[PDB]
């Protein structure tokens, strides 16, 4: 494999893309030597990660966390366009899937449950889907989740982009010292390293290993993966839909950046810990059912206690604030109970929070179309039809008509067609 | 299921004889010394400290030999604009009325024994306690500085219409700003102008905070004025406390005015287009509970808010 | 729901202190 | 054993509203002419 | 399930499949199966 020279990054403007040197592209990455560093020095770790059992290999950067989320969204994108040609399928979704990395220990049967709507939400979106970097977890089942997916695609393959605080990671030494492109390199994840205790995934397709100069500290990376799944669904125009699964305290606060960038967060209900300190909160704060009015703050403040042990007063306050600042805006949570609600139910709930968001209209019934949602569709488009807003239904109808034909979905052709989309009006995305 | 809980609560719950047994759980943990103490770091000052002092030891009337505290004021005051009171406070009439330049200043302070004044120099002394600073501080006024907190409220109802409850009693929720000082969210509000009453200042500090169209956005329609009077027409007064405000000294401390406009039928409170100006950054509609994180004694606002609407806290 | 409107409009509605903010 | 801190929270909270109801003379078996029972009744209502 | 008792539950589940098993209950059978009772962890009630 001969390593590349030079690298295709797509302009500011989204009108074409520009090629130029690598080390022109990578100097805009720092790395922090010690944690008194503030302004830091080039970063120079970069190249591929190879893996057992794996025949493709994945790539590895080192950035700092004061770096911009588009630069690292550029060369994701400047990778896969070097790769796969121009043309590559772009995402329609952005799943983020967070939770638990430890304490995770959840029953089979509703690890399949779960497992079921993840597969089936990624297959039919053809959806990026960002987690953490490491082999424990919620991670290390979303990556088995993509293992399986990864075998039945021939041409594209969806990324599985880890996102894991660098300084963690055994292989991180290796990683570091040597030449810039370090094309290839074996990464093992039985070595021995006394400081350092957690490896990375072998299942995920892409690293981002965010560094603050820090030996052994968590959650340094939950800032910059918000705003990089922010800054993706700005440049893809697809929604961002995080989904919460147990967890920890770095969830609460992967959550809270998460509602802070305007990102729709999914939380699955009875599966425990802070997902269901999230789910009583947001039941607490909005949900009008009967079986919810003997809820309180005090039950809230004991469940905060019991699963995070805060230690003290300040800490539990603070942990209770964030958590009831998380549910604050009703559109951008939407719970969904694993146990009382049925089985195929959780891609609803997705859908859901897609539809809670407030631009990309032409896109959300874009997703409407691929999770087969006939009637939310007719919903959409009924109180659109209601609410005035002729141009930008005008505007989206040709393109939502051309997609629903490019998909083989005749019922949405059908009702787009019935909403004064002209069949001769149509327009292709490309130019000849 | 939902009316048979109504009715259930709406008839089992419709000094003397009262007797408290919290002792024999606790011990000899209760109520001692619930009193407010500043933090030892002015907001926006450049680092000075105050003079640090135990919770016990705020009040006037217990003995304090070894008090010493900071003389600090902040250089906005000091290079002296129109809302801010002269250096030398002598002169000045407090407890009543006082005109300066022709317009009314308030001066009354809610305590029961009033304000007195230091003999040597003729600066106000705060009674509600110590606060390890004297001066002015970030406050133009010497002694009681007025404000006046809106607290525009409406129920929380659900998209069906129905009334949210919580603990048996209905639930509120309140326009609330996010500070541009210290971050934190509060009620909006602002010191009272110099002739000017608590009317005319809580309804235009609201237009400037919680709506931005202080000059700012642009000019609203004519059943949008026509709402916004409605909806500003049937307001309660419902407290005249103590702020525990960090900005709090010796000299000068704030004390508000807390008016309540609340929407019954939620029209009027629906048509507000909610945008952070002025002194704040966002405006949203929260719900008002016991664990609220609030700037200053914004929660007692809500409290009594709450305690005059019978709603939940 | 006609009831639970009736039921809400009847337990949420069953000089000194009022004030009149309508000059600003 | 000891509570727990949101159980010793929820006790004081049930303790902190009890009303006395009625302080009468008790007709209990081991009342005497020089030594008998009378009570202080006091009432802990849990509304929720 | 929802009120946790993990312990128990898979202390059980093998000896209720197993009986399960004994008198004839295909649905039991599936539905024991579903609750995370390894069909290879049975175990005989007496001893060989
Ligand atoms: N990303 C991680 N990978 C591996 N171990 C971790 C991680 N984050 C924390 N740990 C360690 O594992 C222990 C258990 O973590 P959990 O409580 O299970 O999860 P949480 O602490 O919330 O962190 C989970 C992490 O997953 C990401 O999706 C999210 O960014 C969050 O940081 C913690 O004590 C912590 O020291
Ligand atoms: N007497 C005064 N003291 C201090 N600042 C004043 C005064 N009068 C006008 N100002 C100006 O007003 C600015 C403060 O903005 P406001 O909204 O008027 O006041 P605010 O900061 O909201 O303080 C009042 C808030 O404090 C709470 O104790 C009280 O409940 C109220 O919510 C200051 O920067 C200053 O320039
Ligand atoms: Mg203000
Ligand atoms: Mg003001
Ligand atoms: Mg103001």
């Keep these: 494999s001969v390593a590349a020279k030079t690298l295709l990054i797509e302009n500011e403007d989204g009108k074409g893309s520009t090629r130029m040197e690598v080390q022109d592209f990578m100097k805009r990455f720092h790395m922090h030597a010690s944690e008194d560093d503030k302004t830091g020095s080039p970063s120079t770790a970069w190249g591929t990660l190879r893996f057992p059992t794996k025949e493709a290999t994945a790539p590895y950067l080192r950035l700092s966390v004061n770096d911009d989320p588009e630069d690292a969204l550029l060369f994701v994108k400047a990778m896969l366009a070097q790769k796969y040609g121009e043309t590559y399928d772009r995402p329609s979704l952005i799943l983020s899937v967070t939770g638990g990395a430890r304490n995770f220990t959840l029953p089979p049967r509703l690890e399949t449950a779960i497992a079921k709507g993840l597969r089936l939400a990624a297959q039919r979106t053809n959806a990026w889907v960002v987690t953490g970097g490491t082999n424990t977890g919620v991670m290390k089942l979303t990556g088995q989740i993509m293992e399986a997916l990864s075998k039945t695609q021939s041409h594209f393959i969806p990324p599985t982009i880890g996102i894991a605080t660098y300084g963690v990671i055994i292989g991180g030494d290796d990683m570091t010292r040597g030449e810039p492109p370090k094309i290839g390199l074996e990464y093992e994840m039985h070595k021995k390293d006394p400081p350092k205790t957690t490896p990375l995934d072998d299942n995920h397709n892409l690293f981002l290993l965010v560094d603050d100069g820090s030996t052994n500290k968590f959650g340094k990376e939950i800032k910059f993966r918000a705003a990089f799944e922010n800054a993706a669904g700005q440049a893809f125009a697809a929604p961002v839909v995080t989904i919460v699964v147990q967890g920890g305290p770095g969830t609460l606060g992967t959550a809270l950046q998460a509602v802070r960038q305007g990102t729709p967060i999914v939380v699955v209900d009875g599966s425990g810990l802070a997902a269901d300190v999230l789910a009583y909160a947001y039941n607490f704060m909005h949900n009008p059912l009967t079986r919810f009015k003997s809820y309180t703050i005090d039950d809230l403040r004991q469940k905060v206690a019991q699963t995070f042990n805060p230690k003290s007063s300040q800490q539990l306050t603070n942990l209770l604030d964030s958590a009831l600042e998380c549910v604050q805006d009703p559109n951008l949570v939407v719970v969904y109970s694993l146990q009382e609600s049925g089985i195929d139910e959780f891609d609803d709930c997705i859908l859901k929070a897609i539809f809670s968001s407030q631009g990309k209209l032409g896109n959300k019934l874009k997703q409407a179309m691929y999770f087969d949602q006939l009637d939310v569709a007719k919903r959409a488009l009924s109180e659109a039809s209601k609410n005035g807003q002729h141009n930008e239904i005008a505007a989206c109808i040709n393109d939502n008509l051309m997609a629903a034909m490019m998909h083989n979905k005749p019922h949405f052709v059908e009702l787009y067609l019935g909403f004064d989309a002209k069949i001769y009006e149509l327009k292709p995305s490309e130019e000849v | ?313």
Excluded at chain 2, 107 to 115: A, W
Aim: hydrophobic content about 35%; overall charge negative; aromatic content about 8%.
């Design chain 2, 1 to 313: 299921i939902s009316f048979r809980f109504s009715l259930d609560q709406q008839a089992t719950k419709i000094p003397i004889n009262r007797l408290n047994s919290a002792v024999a759980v606790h011990g000899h943990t209760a109520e001692a010394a619930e009193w407010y103490v500043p933090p030892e770091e002015y907001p926006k000052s450049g680092g000075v400290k105050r003079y640090l002092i135990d919770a016990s030891m705020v009040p006037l009337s217990i003995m304090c030999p070894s008090y010493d505290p900071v003389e600090y004021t902040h250089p906005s005051v000091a290079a002296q604009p129109v809302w801010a009171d002269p250096a030398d406070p002598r002169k000045i009439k407090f407890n009543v009325k006082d005109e300066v330049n022709g317009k009314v200043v308030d001066r009354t302070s809610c305590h029961p024994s009033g304000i007195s004044i230091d003999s040597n120099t003729g600066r106000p002394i705060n009674p509600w306690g110590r606060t390890g600073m004297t001066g002015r501080g970030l406050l133009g006024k010497w002694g009681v500085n007025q404000a006046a907190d809106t607290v525009v409220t409406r129920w929380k109802r659900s998209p069906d219409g129905s009334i949210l409850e919580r603990d048996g009693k209905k639930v509120l929720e309140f326009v609330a700003i996010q500070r541009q000082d210290n971050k934190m969210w509060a009620i909006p509000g602002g010191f009272v102008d110099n002739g000017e009453d608590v009317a005319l200042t809580s309804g235009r500090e609201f237009m400037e905070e919680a709506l931005g169209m202080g000059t700012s956005a642009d000019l609203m329609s004519a059943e949008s004025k026509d709402s916004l009077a409605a909806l500003f027409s049937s307001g309660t007064i419902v407290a005249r406390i103590y702020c525990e405000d960090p900005r709090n000294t010796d000299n000068a401390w704030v004390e508000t005015t807390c008016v309540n406009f609340h929407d019954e039928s939620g029209r009027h409170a629906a048509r507000l287009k909610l945008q952070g100006g002025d002194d704040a950054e966002h405006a949203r509609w929260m719900m008002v509970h016991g664990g609220l994180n609030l700037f200053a004694s914004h929660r007692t606002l809500l409290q009594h808010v709450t305690s005059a609407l019978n709603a939940y806290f």
